[PDB]
Amino acid sequence: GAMGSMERASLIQKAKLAEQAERYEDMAAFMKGAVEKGEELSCEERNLLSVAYKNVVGGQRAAWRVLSSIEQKSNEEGSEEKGPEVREYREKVETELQGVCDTVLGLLDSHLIKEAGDAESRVFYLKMKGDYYRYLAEVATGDDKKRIIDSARSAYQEAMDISKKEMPPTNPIRLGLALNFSVFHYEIANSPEEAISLAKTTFDEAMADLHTLSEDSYKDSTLIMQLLRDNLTLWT
């Protein structure tokens, strides 16, 4: 790896600089290098890893959606034939997206998840595994679509089981996990009723625990709760 000669602390410092500069491909490369040092990641370091790759894959997902929409229109019953270029370029972006997802999943499997014993780290990483299988699912069409969906579901479910046992219902990682699993149900798994039920139960259980929180924790939890509510409004 091209980051193998850089100090771990220097990689983390440069990841933070790259974030400030909105250089998220660099940020991801720095954080990949930090993970490959082999030590576990702190809470802040896990956040840097997540921010970096979410921004990278986020741009890819947006681009893929634009190209897939153009391609679907080119294949409308009445559209002029335009050659292989739209499909080729959608495939190029898709392959790059799948590569980013495979990179993240590879870091989680070698060896972030297996060394993660605390609930905060293990739930974070299993949620991330679910998320990057979900992004693979968004573009999957072959045999393995079913298996990709089941991999996402399995990761999210393991994360849910741990979070319900080990975290209060207002814990922001627990809330964000439930939010993303509800998106999985609605957008990937053709299960809108499950999505709605999970979002509603998550929201209500958090509401009842807000009284235990400081002002700063209350702000964090209610921000994610509002996203659950936003989706429930979109979905109903």
């Binding site: 956040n47 997540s50 921010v51 979410k54 921004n55 998320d131 964000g176 939010l179 993303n180 509800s182 998106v183 609605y186 957008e187 999505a195 994610i224 996203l227 936003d230 989706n231 979109l234 979905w235």
Partner: peptide, 9 residues
């Protein structure tokens, strides 16, 4: 249009 997922920290 699309559902909202967890934003960046």
């Amino acid at each position: 249009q699309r559902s909202t997922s967890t934003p960046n920290v």
